[PDB]
Amino acid sequence: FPRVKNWEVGSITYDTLSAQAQQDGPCTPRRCLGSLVFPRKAPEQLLSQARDFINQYYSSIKRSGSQAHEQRLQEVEAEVAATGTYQLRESELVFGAKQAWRNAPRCVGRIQWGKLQVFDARDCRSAQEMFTYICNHIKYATNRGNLRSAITVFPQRCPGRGDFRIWNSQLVRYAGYRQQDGSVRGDPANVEITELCIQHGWTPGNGRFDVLPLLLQAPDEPPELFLLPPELVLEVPLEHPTLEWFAALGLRWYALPAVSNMLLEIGGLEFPAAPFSGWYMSTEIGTRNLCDPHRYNILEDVAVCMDLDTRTTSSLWKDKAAVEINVAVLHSYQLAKVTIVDHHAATASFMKHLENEQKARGGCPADWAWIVPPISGSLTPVFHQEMVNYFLSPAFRYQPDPW
Amino acid sequence: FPRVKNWEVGSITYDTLSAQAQQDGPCTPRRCLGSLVFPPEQLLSQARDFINQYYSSIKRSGSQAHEQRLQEVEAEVAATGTYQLRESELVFGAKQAWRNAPRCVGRIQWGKLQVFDARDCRSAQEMFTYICNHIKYATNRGNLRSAITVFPQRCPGRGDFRIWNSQLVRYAGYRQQDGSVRGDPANVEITELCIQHGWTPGNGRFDVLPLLLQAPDEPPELFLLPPELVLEVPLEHPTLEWFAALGLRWYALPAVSNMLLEIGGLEFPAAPFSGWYMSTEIGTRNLCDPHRYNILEDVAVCMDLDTRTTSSLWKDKAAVEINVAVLHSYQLAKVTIVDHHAATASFMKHLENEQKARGGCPADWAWIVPPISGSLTPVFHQEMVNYFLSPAFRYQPDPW
Ligand code: HEM
Ligand code: HEM
Ligand SMILES: N=C(Nc1cccc(CNCCc2ccc(-c3ccccc3)cc2CN)c1)c1cccs1
Ligand SMILES: N=C(Nc1cccc(CNCCc2ccc(-c3ccccc3)cc2CN)c1)c1cccs1
Ligand SMILES: C[C@H](O)[C@H](O)[C@H]1CNc2nc(N)[nH]c(=O)c2N1
Ligand SMILES: C[C@H](O)[C@H](O)[C@H]1CNc2nc(N)[nH]c(=O)c2N1
Ligand SMILES: [Ca+2]
Ligand SMILES: [Ca+2]
Ligand SMILES: [Cl-]
Ligand SMILES: [Cl-]
Ligand SMILES: [Gd]
Ligand SMILES: [Gd]
Ligand SMILES: [Zn+2]
Numbered sequence: 115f116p117r118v119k120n121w122e123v124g125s126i127t128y129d130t131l132s133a134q135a136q137q138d139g140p141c142t143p144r145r146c147l148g149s150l151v152f153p154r155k156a157p158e159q160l161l162s163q164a165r166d167f168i169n170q171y172y173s174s175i176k177r178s179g180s181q182a183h184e185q186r187l188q189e190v191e192a193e194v195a196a197t198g199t200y201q202l203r204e205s206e207l208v209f210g211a212k213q214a215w216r217n218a219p220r221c222v223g224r225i226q227w228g229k230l231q232v233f234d235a236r237d238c239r240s241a242q243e244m245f246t247y248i249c250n251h252i253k254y255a256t257n258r259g260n261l262r263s264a265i266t267v268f269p270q271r272c273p274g275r276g277d278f279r280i281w282n283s284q285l286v287r288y289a290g291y292r293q294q295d296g297s298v299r300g301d302p303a304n305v306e307i308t309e310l311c312i313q314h315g316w317t318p319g320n321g322r323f324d325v326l327p328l329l330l331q332a333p334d335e336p337p338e339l340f341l342l343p344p345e346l347v348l349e350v351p352l353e354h355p356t357l358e359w360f361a362a363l364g365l366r367w368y369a370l371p372a373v374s375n376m377l378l379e380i381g382g383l384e385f386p387a388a389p390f391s392g393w394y395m396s397t398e399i400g401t402r403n404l405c406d407p408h409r410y411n412i413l414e415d416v417a418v419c420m421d422l423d424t425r426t427t428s429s430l431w432k433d434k435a436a437v438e439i440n441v442a443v444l445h446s447y448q449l450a451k452v453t454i455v456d457h458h459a460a461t462a463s464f465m466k467h468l469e470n471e472q473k474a475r476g477g478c479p480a481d482w483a484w485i486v487p488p489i490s491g492s493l494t495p496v497f498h499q500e501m502v503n504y505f506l507s508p509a510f511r512y513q514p515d516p517w
Numbered sequence: 518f519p520r521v522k523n524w525e526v527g528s529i530t531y532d533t534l535s536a537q538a539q540q541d542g543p544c545t546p547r548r549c550l551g552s553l554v555f556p557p558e559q560l561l562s563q564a565r566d567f568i569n570q571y572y573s574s575i576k577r578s579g580s581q582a583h584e585q586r587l588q589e590v591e592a593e594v595a596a597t598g599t600y601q602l603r604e605s606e607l608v609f610g611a612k613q614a615w616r617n618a619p620r621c622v623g624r625i626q627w628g629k630l631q632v633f634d635a636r637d638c639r640s641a642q643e644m645f646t647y648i649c650n651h652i653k654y655a656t657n658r659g660n661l662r663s664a665i666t667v668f669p670q671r672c673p674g675r676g677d678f679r680i681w682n683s684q685l686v687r688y689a690g691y692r693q694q695d696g697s698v699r700g701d702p703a704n705v706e707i708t709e710l711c712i713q714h715g716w717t718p719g720n721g722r723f724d725v726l727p728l729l730l731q732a733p734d735e736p737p738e739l740f741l742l743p744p745e746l747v748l749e750v751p752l753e754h755p756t757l758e759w760f761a762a763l764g765l766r767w768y769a770l771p772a773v774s775n776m777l778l779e780i781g782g783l784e785f786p787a788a789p790f791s792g793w794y795m796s797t798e799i800g801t802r803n804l805c806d807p808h809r810y811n812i813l814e815d816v817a818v819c820m821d822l823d824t825r826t827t828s829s830l831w832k833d834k835a836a837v838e839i840n841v842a843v844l845h846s847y848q849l850a851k852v853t854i855v856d857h858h859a860a861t862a863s864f865m866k867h868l869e870n871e872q873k874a875r876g877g878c879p880a881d882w883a884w885i886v887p888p889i890s891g892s893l894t895p896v897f898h899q900e901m902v903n904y905f906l907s908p909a910f911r912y913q914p915d916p917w
Contacts, residue, residue: 116543116550122807132548140519141544141551145535145904147519148544148551149882396828401892408525413893427858428796428844433837433890437830444828458827482552483882488892490833492801493813497888503549 122498131477135504136166148503149483152512157194160382164190164200167381167508171209199272202380208232210380211265214508215390216471220484222496223392223455225463225470226263231255233266241332244268244278244387245340248328251389252285252346256370259348261393261453267378268387278387279516281329281337282307285372285389286347289324300324302408310517314339322410323349323366331516350450354442359419363412367399367443369452377513386513393453395460400440401488412439436489457487461494468499479504525898534877538904539566551903552883555912560782563907564590564600567781571609599672601636602780608632610780611665614908615790620884622896623792623855625863625870626663631655633666641730641738644668644678644787648728649746651789652685656748656770661793661853667778668787669733676733678787679916682707682726685772685789686747689724700724702808710917715739722810723749723766731916750850754842759819765812767799767843769852777913786913793853795860800840801888812839836889857887861894868899879904 593600754760
């Protein structure tokens, strides 16, 4: 078992959980591909995945080997033999969604993994009904700024019928209008989905923070366009506690991060539409979304307004401007009473999570490059913690864009 | 051939050089261990592989001189059990081992390296002389120059040359009855060893350690570095006048002395090399790490920051100003230093050069991305492939 060291404390653990990893990652003894973003391109193997998951469920409730456990295994075996597939019990769906979050190697927020509201939308039958489920999710999760983690699970993939899909990468996203110069107005991350919305009849704006409509796909149907009710989309105007001109930049961000394009896998069943939401870590907005060169790219503009010397790297003007942008995000969200966590508190809670999981399961899959925040890396405890990355199921997985 | 993407630009390359990865790393299809710090006819086969590398690099592949060199090493190892590198082979081997080092962000410089051949060495006193000339050459009154001194290779039946110090210049670290450390906690072990082997200690936070040099099969011997050989930089801040009163300092020359150099199956356990510092090594890791000098909260108190909530980003503001102090102080003292923005930009150019030269470049993302301002540097957005090529710099157990 791999020996794992914390270099701040000198302490040593062994990740025995990794030995149970099912699916394979991209690394070999010859070359490590741990830094790649996308590390990746029935009845018998369905059952082995289903049996393993049922075994996980009955362990979680301290009832392994019980009569109920044996009967549920036999019951899943019979449904798979008769129909080629099976259905989760309500309780198994709730457990499986929490487990998938718990298993997600790139999530620093997993201290919260047991506090997840699971909306069962498996009886959904139309794109219009999808939209109602989505609006109820956003209302519940937003909670007028007191954010609450939630996941809505639409029907599973099954033979003879198309998938439910949410085409948008997140429930709330800003338009990115590809200008003719090859530039972008708005968020360059969303140029594709923006052009698809327009092509599907959306009348576009011309702003930098235009909320996109939803493109929702019901089985064997072209996507359908739905506009979010403005009262449902909580947004935070950005201002700085001591730089009064900062508010004149006209920056904003939205309250609720709600990823809608990943696939949820539980016991071999696949849910291609299962959007989930929590709350933001402030570096996601302040450092990546606003300062990445290929996103809003505001770093130079802020530094010039701060009267920093932008003609030499050695002044550290980039570092200084980024710090103040991160202060603005945190100040602005706290002022608006919208839940947010800074990267110091988030990584401290992740260290606690590693300690809990070492005790509970003997390890924790963790992707160091994603867990370490994009600023102030070695000023947080996770930088000094060795991590082991592997794939457990249930899981959230990437999946191709449906177009 | 792994497909490698830059997410800032969208450009794609393929790493065809990872196919030649000679040794085996720690990762498997089951689990990635990329974040871990420490992951006869045998000698002849590595020796042959290196010779072909060498003659390929000078466009002499397979020809007259290539065959002659292959037969010499064969007869050498038959007679003695090892073999001697030609001086040019040794220079080529040192440079390649740097070029191949996945965790080094400074490899744009790999072709410019002064190699000091100390293979004719015996006794620690001569070791000390080679090291002192290395230090004087590399320091060069603050205009730093990259250098490596190569001491005799390990061979059977004979002991080893070792430099017990992890670096040629290190500050001592002393413990007390409250368990804490005055000085550098990283050097508590070597400091008590220097104390055992003669050295009488100081009681400062920046006492330069003596050298514990080990000649084959003798005990290590205790040598003091002449103070004018050790260039140091007192740290001040361009605008925070109280920063100087903190009394912080660092030394000019980063000279790693505890890694093993491996060339063509030969192993040199004492081969100290030096370059110059990247500012974050000093201002973020050595001064701000919690298990190092750990001065971050001291600076924040001096800056009148709000230290009772993390969301004020007092740690981040204090770290930037410490890195500003480091850069300003080295530049004012006319000592070579590179900030992490310039350094990562140059590594990007290195990646492009190596793509054309060898079809790839082994790189360890966790070590190439700086410990502050990660995503503000271009390397953060660059996917990288990590693998082991030879010649190489390798970790090795401590002598004790
Ligand atoms: C409750 C507060 C939460 C916080 C602060 C948080 C934080 C984060 C952050 C910062 C990332 C990196 C994302 C990026 O850089 O683009 C991430 C990734 C991720 N999170 Fe969490 N998260 C939270 C809740 C959740 C919940 C409720 C779920 C699902 C039920 C979840 C599942 C995931 C997954 C699957 C990833 C990986 C995304 C990928 O691979 O691209 N997280 N999280
Ligand atoms: C000339 C300017 C140079 C710069 C700016 C530079 C920078 C760096 C940095 C920042 C690291 C990370 C080390 C750490 O975090 O402790 C590193 C590692 C390394 N460097 Fe360079 N370096 C330079 C020259 C050299 C030279 C001349 C050699 C050898 C001839 C070399 C070989 C290595 C090796 C082997 C490592 C990995 C060491 C380890 O794993 O601890 N570097 N370098
Ligand atoms: N707190 C949160 N956060 C979070 C969590 C998971 C995933 C994400 C979003 N992950 C985005 C990765 C990314 C980054 C940039 C670009 C991109 C940039 C420029 C152009 C094109 C694309 C694309 C992607 C997705 N591949 C956020 C939460 C959301 C939900 C619960 S918690
Ligand atoms: N510019 C440079 N830099 C650089 C490059 C390579 C290697 C290193 C040193 N790598 C440090 C590894 C390290 C540091 C601290 C501690 C430690 C800290 C606290 C307590 C105990 C130990 C342990 C280790 C290795 N285990 C620096 C150059 C040096 C030479 C040419 S360029
Ligand atoms: C190339 C590299 O893998 C890529 O930029 C990664 C690095 N670490 C990350 N970490 C997080 N949390 N989110 C990201 O999008 C990324 N991007
Ligand atoms: C746990 C982790 O591997 C360890 O802290 C590494 C991470 N990246 C690093 N990168 C550099 N340049 N130097 C280091 O010491 C480390 N430490
Ligand atoms: Ca049924
Ligand atoms: Ca006592
Ligand atoms: Cl986001
Ligand atoms: Cl150092
Ligand atoms: Gd002001
Ligand atoms: Gd004062
Ligand atoms: Zn790996």
